[PDB]
Design a binder for this molecule. Structure first.
Ligand SMILES: CCCCCCCC/C=C\CCCCCCCC(=O)OC[C@H](COP(=O)(O)OCCN)OC(=O)CCCCCCC/C=C\CCCCCCCC
Ligand SMILES: CCCCCCCC/C=C\CCCCCCCC(=O)OC[C@H](COP(=O)(O)OCCN)OC(=O)CCCCCCC/C=C\CCCCCCCC
Ligand SMILES: CCCCCCCC/C=C\CCCCCCCC(=O)OC[C@H](COP(=O)(O)OCCN)OC(=O)CCCCCCC/C=C\CCCCCCCC
Ligand SMILES: CCCCCCCC/C=C\CCCCCCCC(=O)O[C@H](COC(=O)CCCCCCC/C=C/CCCCCCCC)COP(=O)(O)OCCN
Ligand SMILES: CCCCCCCCCCCC(=O)SCCNC(=O)CCNC(=O)[C@H](O)C(C)(C)COP(=O)(O)O
Lengths: 103, 459, 128, 178, 156, 88, 603
């Protein structure tokens, strides 16, 4: 078994060439010659430019344009429980039938 | 309407008197200006129409097609700019003249107050495209493709002339307004059956109907890029426009004469889609996808309901844009590999990433992803067919499934995997090609925001 | 003795279980040698064309061209009308069409009969 | 992979491959190391019993029943190394492998970056240009007539000569380029 | 660069043209086998083994590593059917018939047992749930101008 | 990943380390250039088991055609270095 | 006015800002992942407020803000529904996504395209939010397709790998099979109810027929990977670990169950459809647990665990307990995401090694991962007073106390036992034995990103179940009284599975080698479902697509009928007409014949 002599020499030469090519693949310290030319604080500027502005725009749009038309923004009727009072009208819900309480 | 026709006619003396190295620049600039002018036609009324004169008029169905036809020409010029580099100036001027004549004929075809004028121009369009295919064609089969494309259409359209002259002799006019207003029912007679067949076959052969579609893959493979562009975007919609206009006089016969055709489409849109799964040519694959989409449009037109008509119009526009984009991509690959086979160039996303993005967007549009207008038309037609019969959905669903498959197939074979080693002439993508793709895709996503412009007169 | 493995079209027989590989004759060795010989000649010519710095194109593959031409344009000249092809074409091109026609005609006739009889409950059916 | 194949497979090579594959699948079955070692020495014990067999007919009749028995008990979910042709990362990095010739299409602004690398690249190009011209003649004078009989390449024999067909083996992209 | 004579042609009838076609396709005469001479236009093209592309040797240095093909070798008629992204015919540890029988039996038994459980259900030793105002007639559908038949619930 | 860039020295050290853990071969007799069949009197099954141990040690498996002609430790290290593309 | 609407829309609005900034300069630097993670955290902490408002009062709202178009009597407008389900699922999804992105900032550090990966994750999150908050069928379909296409893009992350591409195509295929039913439901609803808005569908359908609910069930089965269409979810593990952890374990997959929850008023009026849902869920959960029992890859095992959990949620849907199913969605999110994160940490620590045969004693080598996985497995298996307790225990209680299938009940009980069994399998084969990895030890967890991401979900999986269960208002009639044996049946089957699995895994130390049983083989190959169902149909389609579709019909007979027959006839007639020798003898003979014929025939 094993390599034939031609195989060993070919593999050796190919491997030396491969190592030389791979060594050429490295970068000199000056290799990336970048040409320069121009024309909490981060968290605060983020919370301002990424939260406050969108919520301002959305609130304006919903308050003055979306709600201008009927039925666009419609709300679930709040639950009414006995004994409650209503801000708009002022009447009070009469209590229940005093169920027999035990355990 | 003359404000669109006259500049298109003036495009010819401009092209012929231009400098030997400035034809493309002026042609593109003035084509874009004409498109901008034609953008005004989108302003439509819920009433009858914009009747400009006794000879031309516009509708909410003709307006999108006219705008697309006017927008197409700059894209065709940019596509043809590359492969005509080594051509004599006179022959380049001839090619641009053929494109301008084809656009002019389509523009006056889509208005066409009177049916005989519509037929005259709709048959006149056959000449410039035939010359384009048979003259500036790469392969030796361009002659056979031209013969097929010419003779299918001529055989279909010759009985239409007899039917139209017979209509004019009996009713007295072929003006579309008088035809709609004085419409009368068609009795169930053999004479009326052959009348219906003559009136319908001419347009159904150009859609193309399944079984009459043999000419399309040939005429798509052997044509140059501009020919494939124009024949995939607008020239297929001539049949749909014709059926939409002519069906007003075929009732109530169409209620039962449409059965043979519907099946041919309902099965056909499946069969051709399956054909797309096993294809070694990009152009053949896109041609068969076009056949499937136009079969679905045929079903929509034959159903004859409002939702069907709006869906068919939207699908026509979306299919035209997407098919032209896909053919532009295939031609860009061909101009690098010169092979036009699917399995040779592989792993192109590793080499051309922005072109890979364009491929992904084109495939997603062809895949009918929401909320694109492709899906709007597809869904409208599917719902209308469901109302026609609850079983149709099955076939429809299958087609949709298969559709996605082959689209992603076309995306995966060409762009993913390992690049072929022995192709090293893959130059970076030019700015011209990228601009072409952007000008293809941005109008689709813009029309997605205002669907009512492409939903036809029944909106 | 152990349960036998039955190969199928969609699950082929493993190369290690083939009795043919065990039946060794000098003819088989000659056949394998000439197979590897033609393979090596093709590989040599491909590599010679591939490693040449002068070439800046696509290596034309005659096998790929032959495959595509045979798939696309060599069907009809080699096509002969036979009872098998005629019967298969008639079936696969006419049967589905008439079958779907019958299905849809029956469905629509039933729906029309229900509409004429009035017992369909088409309330809220506004868009069609 | 690197080694050119032979026209056929010898009985010794086949039995070595059966031993390798059976040992791997047994390791897959016996998860723990000590149990694996125990059954592996048992496997070697049942494997070398027919080492000294002489005639070809019985030897060929053997290694066949063994293959069938292995097929019946092959552990349908074996352990596969991650980079193996069946592993979880067989072709993970094939998308980061990019040919060298694409660097011929870089804009001069990009070529301005990394000047030493590109100077070395032109040196490699000139070396390949000369070595190819030498290699064509070396290969045509070396090849037997009637076409090569095997896909094995001869090495270099002169002083400045390089191995034939070396460019696309030496300049492989990398195993893990990015 | 391709000439007219190396393109695929008609079905070979004499051994001379059979050997010529085998030489054209870069394969041995004894290994060459065209498709049968029926109406289908397979013609000259060779009937390669129906083996899939997945089970090809993964260690051979192919010219196309992804598709595992070599340059210049004859291409299967259905290559696009076996591209390792589609149907493959690699051998499986269990025979095809056994796998089909086992899955079909499992699914059929599952459906039968589900139907049987539908026939013989499971519940609790309780009576039907009682709702106050005539099984909630007013809040379920309505129709307040009909006065339905009252239903009273039994207190135990 | 965070995998250190192992070198030729490291690979040779690992190979000799695993070889020395093999009791069938003497630690003193083995060298970087020592053959298995002749310089150590091993069997073919011994070579395939040594290849097994190398595969298990380094986490990748060597194809059989390449492993069958890997007869000495130095060429084992060379094959591993070529496969993993290590510079020095 | 009413900050509910403003905040609920603001969360979705600010979730899209980095997508717009993807063309800016920050996308070309290494700070983009931190930017996206910070944006997600801010979105989560902002979305926490409407949930609090609902908890206080019970606020619900529909916002129909943009009017897209009007089609005769139908009106399509951009409408968001912000009911209990949306305002509860948004914070959980945002929390899970924040943890996943923080983990991915460590897991995917070496990937050259990491900014694209974060961009893709954010896009998937946006599409999922669109799906969840949708009020009409068109917007819901938009989200349905967006999550699917984003899953296709993320599974095939390594496009140089064939298996990733085929897995992504498989996922697309099964999701389109579900899309068939979704489109059928949309067509039915617009044809009959004349609207796609949910309110009109609810009003006009008091007794929903079978067809729309059949379509919805098909869509839910397709997207949730039920028994008929299961293999795509386990095969979807070709993608990166972070993607699998969030997209396939806790968020995108639950889309089908969420869709069935959205239409629960119509589901309760149909008795057949509920039976089909229950049966499909039972078969799904048992088949997936059986498969997971013998699997050897950790990711595949957890994928099958997720499929079993989805089947259990569908079972809950079948017995008419939608709110319980939603609660189980919320809990499964937490502990399944943590399990996937711990698994991915182990793979990254063992040099991209996924098999459990080559990983041994990690209990002491990496303690935080061990304790996190232990807590996640305890919560998954129904350990009381944990996150998974409040959902799974109530599922077991309700399925045991309802007029339902006996086979389905047995099936979910066996599924729970097998869940305990495969959790024990994971722990035993991953943490207890002796090490089995290559000598080069690279084990290290000392990275604050991974530690924080794991511990956040760990605190969640301890406390969030109790918090959510104690904060939401009651939604169903409770089961107050139980027989004692039926009350503890969940714990009983849990400990039975634990003990049996531990006993079976203890025998692997024995020096006995036996060939695998037939039942075991069936379980390993996933019931042979992936084999035949990925070989028999596809082939039988593709061959036809080449034989009948193109060659026989298009290339042979359709060419024979019209073109070739006409050409042959015309050529033959031309040959007959033109073939004259030029002799005037025959010419004048024919002249005489036609003269006599004209004289004798036309008069
Ligand atoms: C940004 C920086 C600028 C900030 C200043 C602006 C602040 C808000 C002020 C905007 C004034 C309101 C306004 O724009 O007019 C309303 C105007 C609608 O016009 P109408 O004619 O009344 O109705 C449509 C039918 N013609 O609303 C808008 O155009 C803006 C809000 C639209 C919602 C956003 C849409 C985004 C999604 C794009 C479409 C996606 C595909 C379609 C989805 C289909 C869903 C069923
Ligand atoms: C109805 C659907 C009809 C099936 C359409 C077939 C499409 C043909 C072309 C597909 C392209 C071929 C393809 O994708 O390749 C096969 C590909 C690769 O196989 P892998 O397992 O990934 O192997 C990887 C390891 N090497 O596998 C697939 O993805 C094929 C999947 C096909 C699924 C077909 C079976 C579907 C059956 C549905 C029954 C359930 C009905 C609904 C039940 C729900 C309850 C209401
Ligand atoms: C009653 C008479 C009816 C007349 C109908 C005329 C149909 C129009 C086509 C006539 C062309 C017939 C001639 C012909 O094609 O010859 C066969 C010819 C032989 O090869 P050549 O090119 O001529 O050899 C060159 C080297 N010397 O074959 C061809 O090349 C055919 C190429 C073009 C094919 C066009 C197919 C058109 C048919 C499509 C449908 C049209 C049918 C119209 C009539 C149908 C009845 C409604
Ligand atoms: C791809 C190739 C397709 C080519 C077109 C196929 C359709 C052919 C249409 C029929 C041909 C003749 C149309 C005649 C024009 C319509 C005029 C009309 O309908 O008037 C009728 C006349 O109708 C006719 O005369 C038609 C007779 C047909 C003669 C030609 C036969 C051509 C072949 C017919 C069968 C094929 C048609 C379908 C082919 C499908 C495509 C393959 C009434 O006339 P009167 O006599 O005054 O009324 C009687 C009461 N006093
Ligand atoms: C769970 C898996 C079950 C699988 C079990 C399979 C059954 C195992 C039992 C197989 C029995 C046999 O060997 S079948 C016996 C077949 N006949 C011979 O082996 C005769 C000559 N042997 C050789 O030549 C070898 O290579 C040898 C000399 C050993 C090496 O040589 P080197 O190294 O010097 O090269």
């Amino acid at each position: 078994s094993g390599y034939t002599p031609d195989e060993k020499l070919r593999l050796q030469q190919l491997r030396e060439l491969r190592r030389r090519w791979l060594k050429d693949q490295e970068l000199s310290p000056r290799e990336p010659v970048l040409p320069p030319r121009r024309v909490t604080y981060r968290h605060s500027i983020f919370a301002v430019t990424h939260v406050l502005i969108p919520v301002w725009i959305i609130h304006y749009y919903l308050k003055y344009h979306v709600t201008a038309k009927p039925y666009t923004v419609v709300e679930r009727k709040p639950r009414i429980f006995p004994g409650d009072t209503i801000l708009e009208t002022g009447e009070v819900i009469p209590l229940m039938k005093e169920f027999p309480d035990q355990h | 309407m003359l404000k669109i026709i006259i500049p298109t006619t003036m495009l010819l003396p401009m092209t012929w008197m231009s400098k030997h190295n400035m034809i493309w620049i002026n042609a593109t600039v003035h084509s874009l200006l004409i498109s901008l002018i034609s953008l005004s036609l989108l302003n439509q009324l819920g009433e009858n129409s914009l009747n400009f004169s006794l000879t031309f008029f516009s509708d909410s169905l003709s307006a999108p097609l006219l705008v697309l036809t006017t927008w197409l020409l700059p894209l065709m010029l940019m596509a043809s700019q590359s492969h005509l580099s080594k051509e004599t100036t006179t022959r380049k001027k001839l090619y641009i003249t053929m494109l301008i004549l084809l656009q002019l004929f389509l523009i006056m075809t889509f208005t066409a107050t009177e049916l005989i004028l519509f037929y005259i121009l709709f048959e006149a369009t056959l000449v410039p495209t035939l010359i384009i295919i048979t003259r500036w064609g790469n392969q030796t089969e361009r002659l056979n493709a031209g013969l097929y494309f010419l003779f299918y259409t001529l055989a279909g359209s010759l009985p239409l002339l007899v039917a139209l002259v017979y209509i004019q002799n009996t009713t007295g006019s072929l003006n579309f307004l008088i035809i709609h207003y004085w419409s009368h029912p068609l009795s169930n007679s053999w004479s009326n059956i052959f009348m219906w067949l003559a009136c319908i076959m001419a347009f159904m052969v150009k859609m193309p109907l399944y079984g009459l579609h043999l000419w399309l893959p040939k005429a798509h493979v052997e044509a140059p890029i501009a020919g494939s562009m124009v024949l995939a975007a607008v020239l297929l919609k001539l049949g749909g426009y014709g059926m939409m206009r002519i069906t007003t006089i075929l009732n109530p016969l169409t209620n039962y004469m449409a059965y043979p055709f519907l099946m041919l489409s309902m099965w056909g849109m499946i069969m051709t889609s399956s054909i797309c799964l096993r294809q070694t040519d990009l152009k053949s694959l896109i041609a068969y996808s076009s056949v499937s989409h136009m079969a679905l449009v045929i079903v929509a037109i034959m159903i004859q309901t409002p939702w069907s008509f709006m869906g068919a119009t939207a699908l026509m526009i979306a299919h035209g844009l997407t098919s032209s984009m896909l053919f532009c991509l295939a031609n860009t690959n061909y101009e690098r590999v010169h092979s036009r086979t699917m399995i040779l160039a592989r792993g192109l996303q590793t080499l051309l990433p922005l072109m890979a993005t364009w491929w992904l967007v084109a495939s997603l549009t062809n895949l009918a992803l929401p909320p694109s207008i492709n899906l709007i038309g597809e869904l409208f037609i599917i719902t209308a067919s469901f109302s026609w019969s609850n079983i149709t959905i099955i076939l429809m669903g299958m087609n949709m499934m298969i559709t996605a498959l082959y689209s992603l197939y076309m995306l995966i074979t060409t762009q993913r995997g390992k690049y072929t080693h022995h192709i090293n002439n893959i130059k970076p993508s030019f700015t011209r090609e990228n601009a072409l793709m952007a000008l293809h895709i941005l109008p689709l996503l813009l029309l997605t925001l205002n669907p009512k412009m492409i939903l036809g007169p029944l909106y | 003795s152990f349960p036998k493995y039955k190969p199928s079209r969609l699950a082929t027989l493993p190369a290690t279980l083939d009795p043919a590989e065990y039946d060794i004759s000098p003819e088989t060795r000659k056949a394998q040698a000439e197979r590897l010989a033609i393979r090596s000649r093709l590989k040599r010519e491909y590599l010679l064309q591939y490693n040449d710095p002068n070439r800046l194109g696509v290596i034309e593959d005659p096998a790929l061209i032959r495959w595509t031409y045979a798939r696309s344009a060599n069907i009809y000249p080699n096509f002969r009308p036979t009872p098998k092809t005629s019967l298969l074409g008639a079936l696969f091109g006419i049967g589905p069409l008439f079958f779907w026609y019958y299905v849809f005609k029956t469905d629509r006739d039933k729906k029309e009969k229900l509409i004429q009889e009035g017992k369909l409950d088409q309330t809220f059916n506004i868009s069609y | 992979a690197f080694s050119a194949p032979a026209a056929y497979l010898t009985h010794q090579q086949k039995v070595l491959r059966l031993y390798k594959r059976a040992l791997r699948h047994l390791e897959s079955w016996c998860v723990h190391r000590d149990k694996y070692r125990y059954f592996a020495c048992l496997m070697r014990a049942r494997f070398d019993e027919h080492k000294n067999e002489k005639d070809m007919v019985k030897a060929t009749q053997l290694l066949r029943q063994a293959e069938e028995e292995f097929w019946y008990g092959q552990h349908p979910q074996p352990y596969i190394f991650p980079e193996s042709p069946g592993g979880t990362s067989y072709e993970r990095y094939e998308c980061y492998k990019v040919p060298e010739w694409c660097l011929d299409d870089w804009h001069p602004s990009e070529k301005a970056m990394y000047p030493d690398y590109f100077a070395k690249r032109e040196q490699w190009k000139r070396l390949r240009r000369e070595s190819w011209e030498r290699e064509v003649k070396q290969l045509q004078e070396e090849t037997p007539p009637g076409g090569p009989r095997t896909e094995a390449l001869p090495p270099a024999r002169k002083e400045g000569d390089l191995p034939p067909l070396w460019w696309h083996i030496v300049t492989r992209p990398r195993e893990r380029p990015m | 660069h391709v000439t007219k004579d190396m393109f695929p042609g008609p079905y070979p009838k004499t051994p001379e043209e059979r050997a010529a076609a085998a030489k054209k396709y870069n394969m041995r005469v004894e290994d060459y086998e065209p498709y049968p001479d029926d109406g289908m236009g397979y013609g000259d093209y060779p009937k390669l083994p129906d083996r899939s592309q997945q089970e090809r040797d993964p260690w051979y240095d192919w010219d196309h590593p992804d598709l595992r093909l070599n340059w210049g070798e004859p291409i299967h008629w259905d290559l696009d059917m076996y591209i390792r992204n589609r149907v493959d015919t690699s051998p499986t540890p269990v025979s095809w018939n056994t796998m089909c029988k086992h899955l079909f039996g499992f699914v059929a038994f599952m459906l039968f047992m589900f139907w049987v459980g539908e026939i013989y259900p499971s519940y609790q030793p309780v009576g039907p749930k009682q709702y106050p105002y005539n099984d909630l007639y007013l809040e379920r559908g309505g129709d307040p101008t009909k006065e339905p038949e009252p239903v009273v619930h039994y207190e135990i | 990943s965070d995998a250190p860039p192992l070198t030729l020295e490291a690979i040779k050290d690992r190979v000799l380390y695993v070889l020395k853990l093999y009791d069938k071969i003497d630690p003193e007799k083995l060298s970087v250039n020592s053959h298995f069949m002749k310089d150590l009197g091993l069997d073919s099954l011994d070579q395939v088991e040594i290849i097994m141990a190398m595969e298990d040690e380094f986490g990748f498996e060597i194809p059989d055609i390449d492993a069958e002609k890997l007869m000495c430790p130095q060429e084992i290290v060379d094959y591993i270095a070529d496969k993993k593309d290590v510079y020095e | 006015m009413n900050p509910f609407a403003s905040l609920t829309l603001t969360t979705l609005t600010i979730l899209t800002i980095p997508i717009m900034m993807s063309n800016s300069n920050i996308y070309k630097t290494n700070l983009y992942p931190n930017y996206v993670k910070t944006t997600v955290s801010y979105a989560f902490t902002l979305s926490l407020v409407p949930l609090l408002m609902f908890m206080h009062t019970g606020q619900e709202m529909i916002i129909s803000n943009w009017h897209w178009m009007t089609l005769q009597t139908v009106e399509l407008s951009l409408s968001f529904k912000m009911d209990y389900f949306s305002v509860m699922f948004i914070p959980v999804a945002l929390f899970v996504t924040w943890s996943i992105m923080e983990f991915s900032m460590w897991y995917m550090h070496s990937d050259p395209f990491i900014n694209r990966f974060f961009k893709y994750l954010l896009l998937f999150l946006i599409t999922m939010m669109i799906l969840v908050t949708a009020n009409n069928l068109f917007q819901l379909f938009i989200g349905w397709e967006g999550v699917g296409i984003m899953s296709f893009l993320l599974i095939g992350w390594w496009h140089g790998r064939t298996d990733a591409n085929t897995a992504a195509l498989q996922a697309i295929l099964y999701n389109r099979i579900g899309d068939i039913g979704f489109v059928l439901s949309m067509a039915w609803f617009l044809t009959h109810s004349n609207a796609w808005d949910l309110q009109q569908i609810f009003m006009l359908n008091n007794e929903c027929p079978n067809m729309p609910l059949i379509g919805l069930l098909l869509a839910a089965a397709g997207k949730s990977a039920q028994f008929g269409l299961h293999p795509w979810l386990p095969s979807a593990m070709e993608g990166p670990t972070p993607v699998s952890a969030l997209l396939h374990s806790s968020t995108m997959v639950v889309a089908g169950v969420f869709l069935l929850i959205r239409f629960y008023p119509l589901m309760e009026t149909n008795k057949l459809v509920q039976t089909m849902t229950l049966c499909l869920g039972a078969i799904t959960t048992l088949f997936t647990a059986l498969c997971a029992i013998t699997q050897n890859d950790i990711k595949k095992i957890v994928a099958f665990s997720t499929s079993s959990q989805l089947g259990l949620m569908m079972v809950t849907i079948g017995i008419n307990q939608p709110h319980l199913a939603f609660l189980h969605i919320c809990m499964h999110a937490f502990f399944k995401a943590m399990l996937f994160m711990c698994s991915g940490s182990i793979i990254h620590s063992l040099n991209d090694e996924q098999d459990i045969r080559k990983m041994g004693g990690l209990y002491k080598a990496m303690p935080f991962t061990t304790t996190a996985l232990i807590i996640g497995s305890l919560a998954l298996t129904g350990m009381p007073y944990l996150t998974g307790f409040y959902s799974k225990d109530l599922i077991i209680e309700a399925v045991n106390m309802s007029y339902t299938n006996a086979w389905a009940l047995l099936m979910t009980l066996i599924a729970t036992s097998l869940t305990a069994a495969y959790s024990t399998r994971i722990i035993f084969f991953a943490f207890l034995g002796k090490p089995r990895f290559p000598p080069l030890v690279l084990i290290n967890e000392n990275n604050p990103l991974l530690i924080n991401s794991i511990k956040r979900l760990l605190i969640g999986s301890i406390f969030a179940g109790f918090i959510i269960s104690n904060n939401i208002p009651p939604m169903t009639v409770p089961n107050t009284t139980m027989p004692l044996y039926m009350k503890m049946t969940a714990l009983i089957v849990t400990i039975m599975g634990f003990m049996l699995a531990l006993e079976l895994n203890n025998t692997t130390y024995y020096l006995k080698f036996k060939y695998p049983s037939q039942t075991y083989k069936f379980s390993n190959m996933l019931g042979y479902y992936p084999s035949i169902m990925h070989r028999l149909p596809t082939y039988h389609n593709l061959s036809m697509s080449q034989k009948s579709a193109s060659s026989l019909l298009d290339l042979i007979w359709l060419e024979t009928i019209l073109p070739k027959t006409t050409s042959f006839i015309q050529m033959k007639m031309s040959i007959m007409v033109s073939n004259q020798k030029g002799l005037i003898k025959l010419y004048f003979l024919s002249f005489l014949i036609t003269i006599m014929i004209s004289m004798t025939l036309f008069n």
